[PDB]
Every structure is written in structure tokens, then in C-alpha cells.
Write an enzyme that holds these catalytic residues in place. Structure first.
Site, PDB file in Angstrom:
ATOM      1  N   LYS A  26       0.858  -1.036   0.046  1.00  0.00           N
ATOM      2  CA  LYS A  26      -0.104   0.086  -0.002  1.00  0.00           C
ATOM      3  C   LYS A  26       0.955   1.325  -0.033  1.00  0.00           C
ATOM      4  O   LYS A  26       1.341   1.801   1.000  1.00  0.00           O
ATOM      5  CB  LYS A  26      -0.996   0.018   1.347  1.00  0.00           C
ATOM      6  CG  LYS A  26      -1.613  -1.084   1.302  1.00  0.00           C
ATOM      7  CD  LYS A  26      -2.814  -1.497   0.414  1.00  0.00           C
ATOM      8  CE  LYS A  26      -3.584  -2.755   0.759  1.00  0.00           C
ATOM      9  NZ  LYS A  26      -4.706  -3.151   0.028  1.00  0.00           N
ATOM     10  N   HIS A 136      14.785  -6.190  -3.261  1.00  0.00           N
ATOM     11  CA  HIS A 136      14.712  -7.470  -4.246  1.00  0.00           C
ATOM     12  C   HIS A 136      14.694  -7.436  -5.595  1.00  0.00           C
ATOM     13  O   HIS A 136      15.131  -8.171  -6.288  1.00  0.00           O
ATOM     14  CB  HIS A 136      13.217  -8.106  -3.938  1.00  0.00           C
ATOM     15  CG  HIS A 136      13.089  -8.516  -2.351  1.00  0.00           C
ATOM     16  ND1 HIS A 136      14.184  -9.225  -1.830  1.00  0.00           N
ATOM     17  CD2 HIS A 136      11.854  -8.418  -1.544  1.00  0.00           C
ATOM     18  CE1 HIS A 136      13.679  -9.555  -0.638  1.00  0.00           C
ATOM     19  NE2 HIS A 136      12.235  -9.334  -0.497  1.00  0.00           N
ATOM     20  N   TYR A 217      32.701  -9.934   2.279  1.00  0.00           N
ATOM     21  CA  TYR A 217      32.094  -8.645   2.110  1.00  0.00           C
ATOM     22  C   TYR A 217      30.550  -8.755   1.943  1.00  0.00           C
ATOM     23  O   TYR A 217      30.013  -7.816   1.576  1.00  0.00           O
ATOM     24  CB  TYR A 217      32.929  -7.467   1.200  1.00  0.00           C
ATOM     25  CG  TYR A 217      34.260  -7.400   1.473  1.00  0.00           C
ATOM     26  CD1 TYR A 217      35.344  -8.214   1.113  1.00  0.00           C
ATOM     27  CD2 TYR A 217      34.642  -6.314   2.219  1.00  0.00           C
ATOM     28  CE1 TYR A 217      36.735  -7.838   1.338  1.00  0.00           C
ATOM     29  CE2 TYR A 217      35.979  -5.928   2.458  1.00  0.00           C
ATOM     30  CZ  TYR A 217      36.883  -6.838   2.090  1.00  0.00           C
ATOM     31  OH  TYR A 217      38.488  -6.511   2.489  1.00  0.00           O
TER      32      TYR A 217
HETATM   33  N1  LIG Z   1      11.227  -6.832   1.148  1.00  0.00           N
HETATM   34  C1  LIG Z   1      10.583  -5.875   0.847  1.00  0.00           C
HETATM   35  C2  LIG Z   1      11.225  -4.640   0.665  1.00  0.00           C
HETATM   36  C3  LIG Z   1      10.704  -3.443  -0.043  1.00  0.00           C
HETATM   37  C4  LIG Z   1       9.767  -3.672  -0.696  1.00  0.00           C
HETATM   38  C5  LIG Z   1       9.128  -2.699  -1.443  1.00  0.00           C
HETATM   39  C6  LIG Z   1       8.500  -2.822  -2.684  1.00  0.00           C
HETATM   40  C7  LIG Z   1       8.158  -1.482  -3.487  1.00  0.00           C
HETATM   41  C8  LIG Z   1       8.186  -0.408  -2.783  1.00  0.00           C
HETATM   42  F1  LIG Z   1       7.551   0.823  -3.590  1.00  0.00           F
HETATM   43  C9  LIG Z   1       8.571  -0.203  -1.407  1.00  0.00           C
HETATM   44  C10 LIG Z   1       9.056  -1.323  -0.897  1.00  0.00           C
HETATM   45  C11 LIG Z   1       8.860  -4.863  -0.680  1.00  0.00           C
HETATM   46  C12 LIG Z   1       9.343  -6.035  -0.068  1.00  0.00           C
HETATM   47  N2  LIG Z   1       8.807  -7.209  -0.350  1.00  0.00           N
HETATM   48  C13 LIG Z   1       8.415  -8.028   0.620  1.00  0.00           C
HETATM   49  O1  LIG Z   1       8.353  -7.977   1.846  1.00  0.00           O
HETATM   50  C14 LIG Z   1       7.491  -9.250   0.191  1.00  0.00           C
HETATM   51  C15 LIG Z   1       8.076 -10.280  -0.455  1.00  0.00           C
HETATM   52  C16 LIG Z   1       7.772 -11.597  -0.863  1.00  0.00           C
HETATM   53  C17 LIG Z   1       6.126 -11.611  -1.241  1.00  0.00           C
HETATM   54  C18 LIG Z   1       5.211 -11.444  -0.175  1.00  0.00           C
HETATM   55  C19 LIG Z   1       6.187 -11.427   0.883  1.00  0.00           C
HETATM   56  C20 LIG Z   1       6.626 -10.065   1.409  1.00  0.00           C
HETATM   57  O2  LIG Z   1       7.345 -12.463   0.504  1.00  0.00           O
HETATM   58 CA   LIG Z   2      30.364  -6.967  -1.436  1.00  0.00          CA
HETATM   59 ZN   LIG Z   3      10.623  -7.493   3.364  1.00  0.00          ZN
END
Ligand SMILES: Nc1ccc(-c2ccc(F)cc2)cc1NC(=O)[C@@H]1C[C@H]2CC[C@@H](C1)O2
Ligand SMILES: [Ca+2]
Ligand SMILES: [Zn+2]
Ligand SMILES: [Ca+2]
Length: 369
Positions: A26, A136, A217
Site C-alpha cells: 500500500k 529485491h 564482504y
Molecule cells: N522486502 C521488501 C522490501 C521492500 C519492498 C518494497 C517494494 C516496493 C516499494 F515501492 C517499496 C518497498 C517490498 C518487499 N517485499 C516483501 O516484503 C514481500 C516479498 C515476498 C512477497 C510477499 C512476501 C513479502 O514475500
Molecule cells: Ca560485497
Molecule cells: Zn521485506
């Protein structure tokens, strides 16, 4: 020591981007964070900037031309025409096509790269972009709701002026895109604390330590369900202090993913906002140029609390536990307080486990020159 200059990056359009019905990401939570910290009066103590929209030139400093060309072209109205490429780039399902997807990537990226430039110019001590931390995203692949790796792009910006950059990741998930980008270099040390074992993204084993020039590292602290403030505080300051001693970075990037908080819709950790924010306090004491980024977080009332408090921590500003009135005041019921209680879930991380993993990481940190 002392109080430090903070520059904060926010675009008021960020809250209007929508992943689709039932999708747990969201972008509204960034607006909630902004509105809460404005209502605490924290705008009086920092410079607020609107990020530029990051260009294709900026994004292709890491990502492939074909992947960025795809992100620029793909829309809900033309999805049938890109059926092959959607699968190739891992877009359509967990990383859906939604209206203004590319503009959303440009905004989140723009804040992180702008913050890095500000730090490079020595015009701020801290830069904050809560819309960033998309750890990711890969060179030619979306993953885990992330399309463009703003962190990798911001670190590449910092590497123009900094020989050694330290990346620290307190998101519940492994910072796999960031680790992979810098896996074979000693110019970025990546340090990830995360849930490990039958969990997304499946990487970040204790034994993943880097390769080639990058050997020793990459640092990974694998954790079990239900870690609490005491257990996290047991290991965070010791690990980061040792990393600072051995690596001696000239800039730091801290990903502050809030999906490690107690009561997160997707996460299985048990940290409070105070325990999460203790990490910001620890990193800030070293007095290095610091880029603070967001990340995951799916119980959005707690995301807003966490990043509001961590902005207050960055400013050395005490704020009251009683929440001020704001546009999303009803989201913070039934208590209407800033700080959260941990749940009664079992901490599967024993004190002996925490010390043992710490001691094995200490062995690896002895191998730095
Ligand atoms: N870790 C992370 C960090 C940043 C953003 C993120 C992505 C888009 C943005 F605009 C801002 C932040 C998303 C995640 N994704 C997760 O935490 C999901 C990974 C998989 C799929 C469901 C569950 C949770 O496992
Ligand atoms: Ca490194
Ligand atoms: Zn996460
Ligand atoms: Ca992590």
C-alpha cells in the site's frame, strides 16, 4: 557527535499508486508516515525535498536496457502484447502491472539517488527516503513487489565519492538484490539480518560470505520466527561495531524495512518500534554520511509509527507517545499511541543461538585486511 543535518525526500503523488485489489503493498503508507511526522512538527527540524523522477539513463547504471525499456512500455491496456516479456521480467502476478508503474519506480528511485547526491556534496549528514529500500529488484527482473533497485543505484552514486560503502538491512527478508549486485566487490559490504528457512527469497545463509574480491564482504545473520527487542539488541550493536572497526566505511546505507515489526501482516518477527529504531540509533552514533531508506511493511499503522519515530531519532527530537491529530487518526486505534506492544508469540531464537551465529560472523570479520 552532536545533532546532524537531515534532508527528507517525499512526493505527495506516491500515496495514489495502487497495486490492485487485495495486494498487501500500500503506497498510501508513505503518505500516512508523512502526514503523521508533519503533525508531530518534525518539518520544523529538517529540509523537505520533492524527488525528481529518475530517468532511464539513471536506472540503466544498474538495470539492463531491455528491462527498463519494458518497464517504460508495459501498461494494463497492452498486457496481452507483452505476454512473453512479462514472464521473462517476472511482472504480472506478485509484481503486477498497474497504472503509472514506471512513474512509481521513478519517484521511489529519485529520492534515493537525490539523497546520495546530497550526501556526496557534503550538504547533509543524513538523507531520508521512506519510499525507497526496494532491495529485491534484480538487474533484469522484478521480485517481491520491487521493480527498480533504488538502493543499488544510490550505492553506485555514493561510490563516485566513497571508496567503501556499508549497507545494513533490517527488513525481515534477505536483501538479495543488493547483495547480488555487490557480491564480487570489496567496495560495498552488505550486512543483512533476516528470517531464514522456508522463507522468501530463499537466500542469505550464514555461509554466503561473498566471492572473489568480495569474499568476506557479504554478512548474513539468519533468524527464526518471533525475534524480540532483547534478542535483536543482543547482536545488532556488537555486529555493526565490529563491521565498522574492520571495514571502516566512509558512507552508510540503512534499509529500515518495517516488516520486521510485531503484528506485520506478512512478517513473523516480534520487534517494537523502539527495538527497530535502536538500530537507527546504533548506526547514527558512528557519525558517517547516512542514507536511510524504507522497505517492507504491511500493517500500515505500524509502518507510519515506525518511520515517524525513526525520523525523530535521526533528528535527536523526543516526541510524545500520545499521537497528534492527523488525516489518518482512525488507523491508529484503539490506543492512538506511537509505540506498540510485542505479541505473546514464541521467540524461536534462543540466546545461545544468537551468540553462536554472532561468534561465527566474528570469525569471518577477522579475515578482513
Ligand atoms: N522486502 C521488501 C522490501 C521492500 C519492498 C518494497 C517494494 C516496493 C516499494 F515501492 C517499496 C518497498 C517490498 C518487499 N517485499 C516483501 O516484503 C514481500 C516479498 C515476498 C512477497 C510477499 C512476501 C513479502 O514475500
Ligand atoms: Ca560485497
Ligand atoms: Zn521485506
Ligand atoms: Ca534484512
Amino acid at each position: 557527535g552532536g545533532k546532524k543535518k537531515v534532508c527528507y525526500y517525499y512526493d505527495g503523488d506516491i500515496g495514489n499508486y495502487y497495486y490492485g485489489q487485495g495486494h498487501p503493498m500500500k503506497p498510501h503508507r508513505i503518505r500516512m508516515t508523512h502526514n503523521l511526522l508533519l503533525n508531530y512538527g518534525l518539518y520544523r527540524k529538517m529540509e523537505i525535498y520533492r524527488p525528481h523522477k529518475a530517468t532511464a539513463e539513471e536506472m540503466t547504471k544498474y538495470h539492463s536496457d531491455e528491462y527498463i525499456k519494458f518497464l517504460r512500455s508495459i501498461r494494463p491496456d497492452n498486457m496481452s502484447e507483452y505476454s512473453k516479456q512479462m514472464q521473462r521480467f517476472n511482472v504480472g502476478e506478485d509484481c503486477p502491472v498497474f497504472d503509472g508503474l514506471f512513474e512509481f519506480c521513478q519517484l521511489s528511485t529519485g529520492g534515493s539517488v537525490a539523497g546520495a547526491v546530497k550526501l556526496n556534496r557534503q550538504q547533509t549528514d543524513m538523507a531520508v527516503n521512506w519510499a525507497g529500500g526496494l532491495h529485491h529488484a534484480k538487474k533484469s527482473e522484478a521480485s517481491g513487489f520491487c521493480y527498480v533497485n533504488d538502493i543499488v543505484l544510490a550505492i553506485l552514486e555514493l561510490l563516485k565519492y566513497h571508496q567503501r560503502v556499508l549497507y545494513i538491512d533490517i527488513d525481515i527478508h534477505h536483501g538479495d538484490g543488493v547483495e547480488e549486485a555487490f557480491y564480487t566487490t570489496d567496495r560495498v559490504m552488505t550486512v543483512s539480518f533476516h528470517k531464514y528457512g522456508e522463507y522468501f527469497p530463499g537466500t542469505g545463509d550464514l555461509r554466503d560470505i561473498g566471492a572473489g574480491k568480495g569474499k568476506y564482504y557479504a554478512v548474513n545473520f539468519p533468524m527464526r520466527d518471533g525475534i524480540d527487542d532483547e534478542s535483536y539488541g543482543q547482536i545488532f550493536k556488537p555486529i555493526i561495531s565490529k563491521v565498522m572497526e574492520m571495514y571502516q566505511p566512509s558512507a552508510v546505507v540503512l534499509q529500515c524495512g518495517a516488516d520486521s515489526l510485531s503484528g506485520d501482516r506478512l512478517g513473523c518477527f516480534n520487534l517494537t518500534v523502539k527495538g527497530h529504531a535502536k538500530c537507527v540509533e546504533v548506526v547514527k552514533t558512528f557519525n558517517l554520511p547516512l542514507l536511510m531508506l524504507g522497505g517492507g511493511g504491511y500493517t500500515i499503522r505500524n509502518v507510519a509509527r515506525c518511520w515517524t519515530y525513526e525520523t525523530a531519532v535521526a533528528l535527536d527530537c523526543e516526541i510524545p507517545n500520545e499521537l497528534p491529530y492527523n488525516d489518518y487518526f482512525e488507523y491508529f486505534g484503539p490506543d492512538f499511541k506511537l509505540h506498540i506492544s510485542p505479541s505473546n508469540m514464541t521467540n524461536q531464537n534462543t540466546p545461545e543461538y544468537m551468540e553462536k551465529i554472532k561468534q561465527r560472523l566474528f570469525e569471518n570479520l577477522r579475515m578482513l585486511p
